[PDB]
Design a protein around this ligand. Structure first.
Ligand code: CL
Ligand code: CL
Ligand code: CL
Ligand code: CL
Ligand code: CL
Ligand code: CL
Ligand code: CL
Ligand code: CL
Ligand code: CL
Ligand code: CL
Ligand code: CL
Ligand code: CL
Lengths: 303, 309
């Protein structure tokens, strides 16, 4: 996932209401533009800071790649790049110049969105390097974190998995039954679900046994699992939907002997609100532990 | 959603272990029997009772239409080659602990058996064919005999499949529709999973899960009220056609286990086992007024999504 900083000093109102970003494709003199070319580098899931009227008004999430589209009609008045941007207004609408002594050390030598004095540069879309991105996020506060962790940063993972499902569904060589089972297993259906039900009986965390209230979740994700692992009843848990949400995204994981592990970026208010207690949720078998190790080391959100 | 009855006789274990059903597709002359043709009528999400050794052993959910596939095991007598090509269905088995013996309840079942093509004779002996249709009234009686385990498989689970199938087909149609504005297309598709302009607009009128109180954006699902699939394009992108919900509340609401009155009073379905609310520490009660714009959609939800009767 990449971060971008978009300077909309004079266009924000219109771009926010329409849920987009727009720029020309090239310079007036016909040459390639580093800054316009930034638009073609944006991927769904990427985080975009809206900088307008001196303020960061939104921490947004890109929902498209750049697509060719007509310049927006403005009242009283050639195709450019459009990006669908899912705006998220933040309560803490900050002015970056005020924190420049803290920010300056982490500004890039070239293509910086801010000058060394704290004033903005005059391009439209800047890349924000990852160290700097975290500093901006620090200043906005936890609401920027709400946009990112387990939200914006899940999108690229879903994109990758969507493409793996496409590779399988369109594979003209793979056995038809195998195709169906691998695809259905992604959403906890098919032989994977039946096999899991012979290993697990209930949601570890909430105790619910009712099959219509449980999600068949993989431990090692479906996307990175090989075909055996995708259909292995030992590579799963039956979880209540809110617990599936926390586990799938790596807000929680488990020790081999059952203790729930919590990510640094899980807000503890959530667990309080849903009456999920910390503690031990039972031994995992040796076969399950193989997968849970993978989850701890690759899915669980750990800086 | 339709119900079926598969008489698996002495090969339940192999068909269970393989997660399938298999039948011939035709007689030698190209004609189908009624029972071979039944395989071609099964749709994903349909419920299939596995009957073997006189017992109902599984309440399964079909996960495919019938597809051409070679006979999974050998015939008892080395048969003709044409007969090896049949219909396969991927069946998601769900074992039940309460294994009903239909013949021991024949007096209760007999009145609801069909005049023709029935899975059972009037004395409760099974018929010779493989896949039988179970009409809906007969199905309800079978479910009553099996009890809550059957209900668990069906309501909010098997019966959600056809709704997902429809929503998937619609997304495909929209995505490939050349006549739609490119930006509109992207917005309509993203809105299905609570993304894009729909979510930003919902955030202008709602701020938290009303049921759990959670305000954190990364722990909320942007749900529609009137479902995305049945909504028109204005309704799909309307921020008033939504609620922010914790994932488990999104689950209960989307499937119609709960709904809300216009003043926010939570309505709980008779199909909701109240143990679930206790296990997840969710209270009944009042969750605040909706706006007139939201009430339009909530009325639809109460009348068409909420599980009644
Ligand atoms: Cl050039
Ligand atoms: Cl460039
Ligand atoms: Cl400030
Ligand atoms: Cl200010
Ligand atoms: Cl840049
Ligand atoms: Cl297994
Ligand atoms: Cl461990
Ligand atoms: Cl016939
Ligand atoms: Cl076929
Ligand atoms: Cl008959
Ligand atoms: Cl008879
Ligand atoms: Cl019999």
């Amino acid at each position: 996932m990449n971060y971008w900083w978009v300077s909309q000093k004079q266009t924000f109102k219109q771009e926010f209401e329409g849920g987009y970003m727009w720029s020309p494709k090239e310079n007036k003199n016909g040459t390639q533009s580093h800054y316009y070319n930034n638009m073609t580098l944006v991927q769904p899931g990427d985080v975009v800071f809206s900088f307008a009227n001196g303020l960061i008004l939104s921490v947004g999430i890109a929902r498209s790649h750049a697509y060719s589209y007509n310049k927006p009609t403005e009242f009283g008045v050639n195709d450019g790049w459009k990006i669908d941007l899912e705006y998220h207004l933040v309560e803490n609408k900050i002015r970056p110049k005020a924190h420049i002594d803290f920010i300056r050390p982490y500004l890039p030598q070239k293509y910086s969105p801010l000058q060394d004095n704290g004033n903005g540069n005059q391009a439209y879309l800047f890349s924000v390097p990852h160290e700097l991105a975290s500093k901006v996020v620090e200043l906005i506060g936890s609401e920027a974190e709400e946009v990112i962790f387990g939200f914006a940063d899940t999108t690229e993972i879903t994109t990758t998995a969507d493409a793996i499902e496409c590779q399988i569904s369109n594979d003209a060589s793979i056995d038809e039954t195998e195709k169906h089972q691998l695809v259905k297993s992604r959403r906890g259906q098919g032989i994977f679900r039946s096999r899991l039900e012979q290993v697990e009986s209930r949601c570890r965390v909430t105790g619910v046994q009712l099959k219509n209230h449980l999600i068949a979740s993989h431990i090692k994700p479906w996307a990175v699992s090989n075909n055996q692992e995708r259909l292995d009843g030992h590579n799963g848990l039956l979880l209540a939907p809110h617990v599936d949400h926390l586990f799938d995204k790596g807000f929680i994981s488990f020790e081999d002997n059952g203790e729930m592990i919590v990510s640094e970026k899980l807000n503890l208010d959530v667990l309080k609100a849903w009456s999920i207690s910390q503690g031990n949720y039972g031994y995992f078998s040796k076969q399950q532990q193989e997968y849970m190790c993978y989850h701890r080391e690759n899915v669980f959100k750990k800086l």
